[PDB]
Design a protein around this nucleic acid. Sequence first.
RNA 1: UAUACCUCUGCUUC
RNA 2: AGUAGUAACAAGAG
Lengths: 41, 733, 257, 48
Amino acid sequence: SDMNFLDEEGKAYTAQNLRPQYEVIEGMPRTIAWMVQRSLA
Amino acid sequence: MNINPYFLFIDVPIQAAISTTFPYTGVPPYSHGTGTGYTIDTVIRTHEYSNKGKQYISDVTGCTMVDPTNGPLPEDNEPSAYAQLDCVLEALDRMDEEHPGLFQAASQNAMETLMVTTVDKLTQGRQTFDWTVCRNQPAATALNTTITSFRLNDLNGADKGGLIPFCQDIIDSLDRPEMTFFSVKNIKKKLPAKNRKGFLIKRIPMKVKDKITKVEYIKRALSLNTMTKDAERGKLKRRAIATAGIQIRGFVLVVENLAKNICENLEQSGLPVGGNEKKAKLSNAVAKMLSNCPPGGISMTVTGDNTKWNECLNPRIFLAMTERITRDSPIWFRDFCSIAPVLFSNKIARLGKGFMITSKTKRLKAQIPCPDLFSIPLERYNEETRAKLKKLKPFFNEEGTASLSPGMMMGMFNMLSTVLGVAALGIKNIGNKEYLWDGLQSSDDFALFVNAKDEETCMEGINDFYRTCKLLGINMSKKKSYCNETGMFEFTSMFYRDGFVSNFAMELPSFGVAGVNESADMAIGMTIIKNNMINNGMGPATAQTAIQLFIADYRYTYKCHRGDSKVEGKRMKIIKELWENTKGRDGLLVADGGPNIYNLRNLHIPEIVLKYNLMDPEYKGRLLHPQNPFVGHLSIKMDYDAVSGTHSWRTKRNRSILNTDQRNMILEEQCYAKCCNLFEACFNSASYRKPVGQHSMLEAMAHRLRMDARLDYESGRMSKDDFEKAMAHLGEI
Amino acid sequence: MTLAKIELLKQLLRDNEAKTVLKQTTVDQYNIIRKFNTSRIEKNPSLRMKWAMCSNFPLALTKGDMANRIPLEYKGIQLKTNAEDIGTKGQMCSIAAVTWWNTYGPIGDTEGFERVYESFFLRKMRLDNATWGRITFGPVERVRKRVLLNPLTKEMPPDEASNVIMEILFPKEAGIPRESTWIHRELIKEKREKLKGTMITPIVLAYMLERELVARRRFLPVAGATSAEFIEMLHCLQGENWRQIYHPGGNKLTESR
Amino acid sequence: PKYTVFRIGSLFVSGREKSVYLYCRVNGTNKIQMKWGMEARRCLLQSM
RNA sequence: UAUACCUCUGCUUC
RNA sequence: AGUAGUAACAAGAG
């Protein structure tokens, strides 16, 4: 994830802009992770 | 011609007209002032019934302990607490033999329940003894203080969420040499002001760390608070009841859950059987005993009641009961279940306020705290108290508390004691004599059926039952209990006479206005009639009368008479206007001076739902305005069916706290309230479903709001400004 | 709304107390600190209400604009006071304030109300459409049996029902998917469609849903009829010494026949 | 014995004159009993 | 002591 | 006084 970021148009690039390409679900608490997953879906 | 209302009983039998022997239209007796005398009475008597046992000084607390169990049997009918372990174990073995699998199954259910049980479970214990402030507090507050206190002693079991780690921390906290806890104290601070003198002094509260030594902590952890029981019906003199600490709650819950899981499967236990089902049990249990011995078989029913029920039953037995019942369960669960009895075996009793001494000459009065109880010549106390205080001495503690090893408190191990009663009912016979007894148990109240060939045998069966119960520490009330030929009897104010008769009086106090609010009390008011028509035998005329009487009470209590009527009042002045303004007057609720549209057939229908189609759009709009200010933040004993409208309001908080030193708790409260009100905005389901997680309460909100922001941006709700601002804010957090 | 939540969060986090509370308190313990208050359990509300109703300003308002739309007095009558309530931190008021609000308050949106409280209205149509028969006096053997008090939409265990309610009202917070969702997808779809536009608070919707999903089964003296739509009228159906023929409206089940 | 009685006139009750007395007494009550007073209509239901 | 013919309180526990 | 009944109120607090 880390290096990858999306630009305001909607294209990937390597890292400035406050919106990564990948959202990290693994690592977080269950109830949060599921909220993220369900919110995204 | 002298009228005699008893003469009715010449025509109608007493069970048939039992309602007329209950004065429930009258006032119930309340207590006045201190209950220390009543508490001391219990302390003296509880030991009076076991003083021939074993006296010994507890090396832990330093208190005087008395042990009746496996003591010398009684040679008289004075309430005996000298139970015999072996006999209890046999009585249990019988129960297990006749109910195999239940003992371990219930334990497994209780265990698997326990494992799932969280800490928040403790918040629904109503009044709880807070050991930090030594006062009766709301369970939630008493818990919160205990957690925040435990946190200072490096005990974070609560943070895991489960009950087990908390209980572990509880039994662990006993080992702590010095227990630290918070205590709030005030501070002046000059806040800026536009006040001639450009400042203002507001006393800002701040928390201070305070210490208690191991023993003094353990003594509090083992302490039980006491108070006189108010409004107790059908009794002349008053008596005392106790309240427990936060520690023992978790350990009692499991034991009572176990005893419940057991009792549920017993056929001679009336607990936790609903009053309606208790008849389904009893009448059948009678029907069985009736058709059992046809040939001259005298089936006798004994209307039972126990004396000193709580004051004779000993924890040391309940411990054995847990130890037996938990045979097949693993060790940790046995150790878990064993604790509450162990605590109750070494419990301490607080003696309330104290005694008030006065001088009529000077017109002066003063309360003497329990510590200072003996800081005065005993001659200055009255004649009875002088006798009590002398007897209290050997069990009296320096800090003004009473040691009380034996006995139970009013309402503690109801289930587990009911089990012990059933265990008595389980024997049924002794020495193969020509009789058989059965019955139904409910704490201190029991009903005993005895079948035999001749009554001379029945009485010996009853005597055998008595003499048996003595060995369990259960004492039958020779004074209040009576026996008769089967056909009619009394049980927990339910009267059987070839079938259970109605006792409409019993429920009569409930007919009045409950005191929740205008919306609820109506629903409740009609529902009570509806139910009493079904269960308690109220005819349609009397019901329709009650429909009237309740509205009568309702309109006076809430001051909402008919809009067309000319009754004056602050509200009525507006009600009349509403009456003049509204077109669909029959659509108006009674609370708004509307007409009562209820009858027998639509008791089960909410008034709003009934009248909805008859309302005006503006009236129903105002009445049911979604964001009206009268209804608060709701969150999901009897429940009712009602609609959330403007009449569904809540009253003001009791303000007496404002001018005491507990002001803090208002800020402490609202401080939480803000966080919870926000957390609820972040997680709307929090009001309905209990949120779960051992992680930080802030973290969840941060993540959730971050996702909300990201999705609201990428979806096309928020603009780049709002998104960047949001992320900028969150970045700092 | 998110921006407002974050802003309020930042404003709240300034307060060291609130910050420490938010950082130290756990998501579990939320269930504890929510129920924390100075309030005490009313042991005699029947009395305390009768007492309180004789006071000047017994009721507590919620802090907000709708409260501010209520005036202090009205034609001499004191509706509300400046003094705040300890609990709500909103103004206190007299019961009259209710009667004013109902008469001259703001007319709010009630669209969806019927669909939200449908469960109750179905009783009203089950009575309104019903037809009564003969009343007959004579003995009645009543058998005490556990019965369903009210007719449901679809009976589920509490755990199963709560998840459905959760799927309907708070889909993002449902957590781990259960099989129930797939089984009642049509019900969820329906209730989702029916309860979309309403302005009523979710906590009420969950209550009314739970009322028509979770079953209320209780022991009652019954004779003859035992169907829910009969039980709900049981008080009228029979006595110990009389009988009343009652034919409830609406459709009836085949299995019940 | 708890009362203090005056004699304050007369009235034509059942056609004939009857002496009107005034019964004066110091009494006392409380919130509980007043409430239970307000809830005394129920005396009907128990008998009905 | 004074403010105090003032102020707060009516189930709010010491 | 009286309410009331095994102990209280007949105001409390700053």
